[PDB]
Design a protein around this ligand. Sequence first.
Ligand SMILES: O=c1[nH]c(N2CCN(Cc3ccncc3)CC2)nc2c1CCCC2
Ligand SMILES: [Zn+2]
Length: 208
Amino acid sequence: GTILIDLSPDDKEFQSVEEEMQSTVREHRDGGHAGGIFNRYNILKIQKVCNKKLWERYTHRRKEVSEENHNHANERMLFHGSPFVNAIIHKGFDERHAYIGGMFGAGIYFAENSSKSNQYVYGIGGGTGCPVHKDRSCYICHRQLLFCRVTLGKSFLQFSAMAHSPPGHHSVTGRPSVNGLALAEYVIYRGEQAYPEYLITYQIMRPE
Ligand SMILES: O=c1[nH]c(N2CCN(Cc3ccncc3)CC2)nc2c1CCCC2
Ligand SMILES: [Zn+2]
């Protein structure tokens, strides 16, 4: 039941999604090893992901969280990079996508920095890079990220350098406590607490 609607680069919606993508690029502590060396992207396409069943699954759960948190879903828009992006847009997030080795336990992880989600597009640590060249820094091959609606509810705040949520909480927030430039990362433990709203197709750009 998934359909993808292509947005025009003239559309304000394309533009505000592009801006969020481009403006949350940062340098990473690995010097580019996982996700490649770049300061910005070439945005090739932005598609709206439309699936009635997945949307209703998302809003049903949002209402539950809201009602357990003084009518505040604490909804954010966050990036998700994954080798399983094609399965996610068709079937939704589920316990199979649970990053077991994640630092906040086995859940589904999201990032405020697009360049952070970019590190996981070809797998954990960037895997072996792109299918075609085995290059984690490939400037040629098309990459995809999701920009997702994520319900955080009452988020457990973790300071720092499928399982269950900590009791009394709907999510975990990873607050950076060393790298002053890094933005937050988040984890949910229920697939229904995120909806994959925009599929972004892009290349990383070789710096001048
Ligand atoms: O976008 C992300 N994707 C992911 N992943 C998406 C893909 N997951 C694929 C996977 C899941 C379970 N086993 C092996 C590979 C790995 C974790 N992790 C993070 C982020 C952003 C914040 C940092 C953690
Ligand atoms: Zn390549």
